[PDB]
A paper describes a structure:
In actively translating 80S ribosomes the ribosomal protein eS7 of the 40S subunit is monoubiquitinated by the E3 ligase Not4 and deubiquitinated by [name] upon ribosomal subunit recycling. eS7 poly- and monoubiquitination is antagonized by deubiquitinating enzymes Ubp3 (USP10 in human) and Otu230,33, While Ubp3 preserves the eS7 monoubiquitination, [name] was shown to specifically remove the monoubiquitin attached to Lys83 of eS730. Here, structural analysis by cryo-electron microscopy of native and reconstituted [name]-bound ribosomal complexes reveals that [name] engages 40S subunits mainly between ribosome recycling and initiation stages. [name] binds to several sites on the intersubunit surface of the 40S that are not occupied by any other 40S-binding factors. This binding mode explains the discrimination against 80S ribosomes via the largely helical N-terminal domain of [name] as well as the specificity for mono-ubiquitinated eS7 on 40S.
Classification revealed three main sets of [name]-bound 40S particles, representing eS7-monoubiqitinated 43S pre-initiation ([name]-Ub-43S-PIC) and (partial) 48S initiation complexes ([name]-Ub-48S-IC) as well as unmodified pre-40S particles ([name]-pre-40S). The pre-40S class contained a set of well-described biogenesis factors, such as Tsr1, Dim1, Rio2, Enp1-Ltv1, Pno1, and Nob1, thus resembling a stable pre-40S particle prior to trimming of 20S pre-rRNA at the 3′-end. The pre-40S particle resembles a late-stage cytoplasmic assembly intermediate prior to cleavage of 20S rRNA at the 3′-end by endoribonuclease Nob1. It contains biogenesis factors Tsr1, Rio2, Dim1 at the intersubunit side of the 40S, Pno1 at the platform, and Enp1-Ltv1 at the beak, all in positions essentially. Interestingly, unlike in all other observed yeast pre-40S particles, we observed uS10 and [name] already incorporated, yet corresponding density is relatively weak. In the pre-40S complex, only the N-terminal domain of [name] is visible, whereas the OTU domain is delocalized and also eS7-mono-Ub is not present. While overall levels of eS7 mono-ubiquitination were slightly elevated in whole cell lysates with the catalytically dead [name], we did not observe any ubiquitinated eS7 in the assembly intermediates after the affinity purification. This indicated that these pre-40S complexes, and likely also the pre-40S observed in our native structure, are indeed unmodified on eS7. Contrary to the initiating 40S complexes, eS7 was not monoubiquitinated in such particles, suggesting an additional role of [name] for 40S biogenesis, perhaps by preventing premature, unspecific eS7-ubiquitination. Of note, we find the small r-protein eL41 stably associated with all mature (post-recycling and initiating) 40S complexes, but not in the pre-40S. eL41 is incorporated into ribosomes during the late stage of cytoplasmic maturation of pre-60S73 and was only found bound to the 40S in context with 80S ribosomes.
Residue numbers in the entry:
A (entry chain A): 2 to 207
B (entry chain X): 2 to 97
C (entry chain R): 2 to 126
D (entry chain W): 2 to 130
E (entry chain V): 1 to 87
F (entry chain C): 34 to 250
The structure:
Amino acid sequence: SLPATFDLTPEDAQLLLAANTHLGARNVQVHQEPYVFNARPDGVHVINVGKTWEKLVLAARIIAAIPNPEDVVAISSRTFGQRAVLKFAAHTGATPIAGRFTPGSFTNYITRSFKEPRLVIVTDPRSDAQAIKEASYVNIPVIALTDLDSPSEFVDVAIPCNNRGKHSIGLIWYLLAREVLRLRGALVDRTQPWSIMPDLYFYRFP
Amino acid sequence: GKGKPRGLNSARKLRVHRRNNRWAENNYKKRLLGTAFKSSPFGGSSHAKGIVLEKLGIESKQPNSAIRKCVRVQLIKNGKKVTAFVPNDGCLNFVD
Amino acid sequence: GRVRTKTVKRASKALIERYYPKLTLDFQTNKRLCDEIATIQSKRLRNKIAGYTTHLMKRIQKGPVRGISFKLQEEERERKDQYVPEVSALDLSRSNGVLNVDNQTSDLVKSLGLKLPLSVINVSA
Amino acid sequence: TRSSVLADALNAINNAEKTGKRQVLIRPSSKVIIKFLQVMQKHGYIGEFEYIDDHRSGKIVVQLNGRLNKCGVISPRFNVKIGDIEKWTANLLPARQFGYVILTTSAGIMDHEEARRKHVSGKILGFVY
Amino acid sequence: MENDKGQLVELYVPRKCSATNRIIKADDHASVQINVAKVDEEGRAIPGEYVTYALSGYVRSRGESDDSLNRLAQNDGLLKNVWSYSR
Amino acid sequence: GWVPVTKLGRLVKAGKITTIEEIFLHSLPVKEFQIIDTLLPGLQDEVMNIKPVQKQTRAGQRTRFKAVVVVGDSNGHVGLGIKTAKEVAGAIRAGIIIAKLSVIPIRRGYWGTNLGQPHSLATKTTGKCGSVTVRLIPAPRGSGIVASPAVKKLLQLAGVEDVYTQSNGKTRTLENTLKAAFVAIGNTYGFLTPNLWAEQPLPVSPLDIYSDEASAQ
RNA sequence: AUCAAGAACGAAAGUUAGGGGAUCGAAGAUGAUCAGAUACCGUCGUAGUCUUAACCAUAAACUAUGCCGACUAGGGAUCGGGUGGUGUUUUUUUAAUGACCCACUCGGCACCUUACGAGAAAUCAAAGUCUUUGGGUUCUGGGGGGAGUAUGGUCGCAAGG
RNA sequence: CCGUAGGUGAACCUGCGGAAGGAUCAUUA
Ligand SMILES: [Mg+2]
Ligand SMILES: [Mg+2]
Ligand SMILES: [Mg+2]
Ligand SMILES: [Mg+2]
Ligand SMILES: [Mg+2]
């Protein structure tokens, strides 16, 4: 149900193998066994990156399916993640949660951090697990970035990537941003590369 | 399998089990030992007629101090002696 | 202990997050500064607030404090985008145009059906 | 030992539905399991089921959709009268609209509605709803 | 249900889960409505019409909502070679 | 006056939601009580238990009042709420709000034949809360609610009139009995009946189609 | 497969008749002491503790969880066996094995997370598949005492069961 | 506390074997 141009462009595959997204953790859960292809024999698994591309194509379609672009909310507490979600929220107009996500923000309308979304993106479902479980109370889909040993409960359309390195998380946020702006209509030509480089999303500590 | 023989030819173990396990009811044990006929002083009857014997001023402390105005009564039909409460009299001027 | 009240602390926090640059290390100028900007009902309370703003001008000149200042917040508004590299680590020239890729991910490339400048590297244990 | 084979089959079906899968591995087979799953299939309570031969006694795959909230077995196969059909139809079913009792009758295996309108009876196996 | 006369006598006929065909009841606050917009040939989304999924909280509390939803997207023609029909 | 704070409030305050079938069909949580107040004019509260409870905190002995409040239509809507407060009127007030929030619909069906209106429960549902199971059986027409007066009063506040009940466990605590009976009566939507095999196209959510009203300013 | 009847084993202490009797050590012999923080402490020490022939049949004999069978979760391990490796090491000249590593695999002792499910809760891969109540089977309990008492039977030299 | 044996005792102590139905801190691989 997609045109043939939507697939892996080889410069994006060079970009993916440049950011070491295909490297992962050492434990493989029962749920995420099809994302692994095989194991490099030290204990490091390598992941099917075509699945990551087409899975973020799904996540881009979920984000484009919402009518109000301010109703999607990005969640972050990792050190790379705040910069990544503030760039994503700057570029698509989402509402970012940087640093400590406030408890009682998805119920409890009294608090000024009460935002009700219809769609939630999470950097990892272990450190930001509280936004996952508070979104499990008020009926919210959550599309997430899960590793090979992330908790796989309470997520749907989860994107396998590497949350450990700053390269992969900044790139995968950049690719979600460029996929949804190429799908909304802000960049008409599918052939044209996006004008902003992916290193804008990258974290530096001075 | 919850601990009972559910075979279609297993009526006898269930029935012996239910017969032997019914002696733990106090009512069944009272009815099929004749307890109401041998140690019950009424002889398993709703009433018994008697001839009074004494005046029992038993004091009974906690929690309510009942000033017991009650009469020791010898029954007629069997010749054993039971105590007996006299109701509603403040004075017991009636059962002399 | 002479712990100051929360009204003096909060008024000094507001007047230093908003009215930073004309306040200085001199309490005597800050007295008529907070007279001319703030409507404080008593001489004692405005002396408390002016002395506290003088003390926070004393320790603000040695370094940054957790509260809000504007002249830093423009600077972390170009900290978000001023350090874009002309060549990133994801570009080809940092590996001379050919990637450092093991045999299994090259098998991923030749199985998925893409053409890519890969150098196979043999790794073990 | 393994006493009944229908009981372990239907218990496996009920456990794999309560954990929410779509396929089972029933082992082993019989006439009774095959004809019982055919009785479920004629009402559309299960989808495809599939029988694998292995020359010992066959393993059965049943592809169950979602439609069976509980089937079960009544393991002492009690003898049921014509007039005793209402008792099992009131005790194990939810109500009087749906819900079935499966009997082995001398005209074959059939549900309690088909045993009513056949006007025969037999021995009780279990119940599908 | 239905009465005799030809008129529906019901409050609401509930949402069935698109994974396990089970009933999403009213207090099931872990339930998810999934919205996917289909695409135009030049890479745009028409914002009015969608393909649509519903996941019960029973599936989501486990964690095979990804795997079942991958199966749903691939059998709805949206995906290929992500979910595998064998393993 | 009343101000809404969420999207569910401003849709019904703008009058775009007709009844509470559209809330129950999409499983939106009712979050303020004014949604149920505006959508249901015919809700009759009825107070069950008043229990004075002695409370100790930092060597301070004060008496609080535990209140059990059931609310319900004469149609199929049941709300139950448990709240303890210091005063009587505040306790029954917080009871009618907490019962007003958690309203759960009931699938009323037929025993045997199919004549007339629905009169009983469709299928047998059980419910457990505490050590108490309460089982609700469908009954023939006009048989009354054969029940303890607590769960009976819960059931003529339910839109049904004909249920046999069967219970077990220590049911002399009316909180756990009414909780288990509330779970049992809410469990009726959830029995997949053969006359609901029919697949339906899934309706779009009201928040999606009505996105530009009820929006945050 | 499970088990009335019946049978084998059954820790310690105990019992008969022998050998031995180093240590420990209920009984007993002895000293004390000085206080109401207090007699636990000491020294000889018989029985015993050890073994042989025969008895005795009780324990907090505990996983306080009958036995067989199926299903419902993984993974870090480990013990015993097996499979495979242009895997390692051990050299002599390459092997062979032996040891180690990896991926498994059965079959045991255990662990950690959950909850779908149970329970009153503590908690539980069984204490789940049980009001939507039936895989097969053995034993026991019916408020607390009176009381494992009275009495009868039975075994034992007795203590006792 | 349990089992067994003994001195006794107004209570109770002691010999042998079991159980926790009794409270894992720190440290390291
Ligand atoms: Mg009772
Ligand atoms: Mg015996
Ligand atoms: Mg014993
Ligand atoms: Mg007794
Ligand atoms: Mg005890």
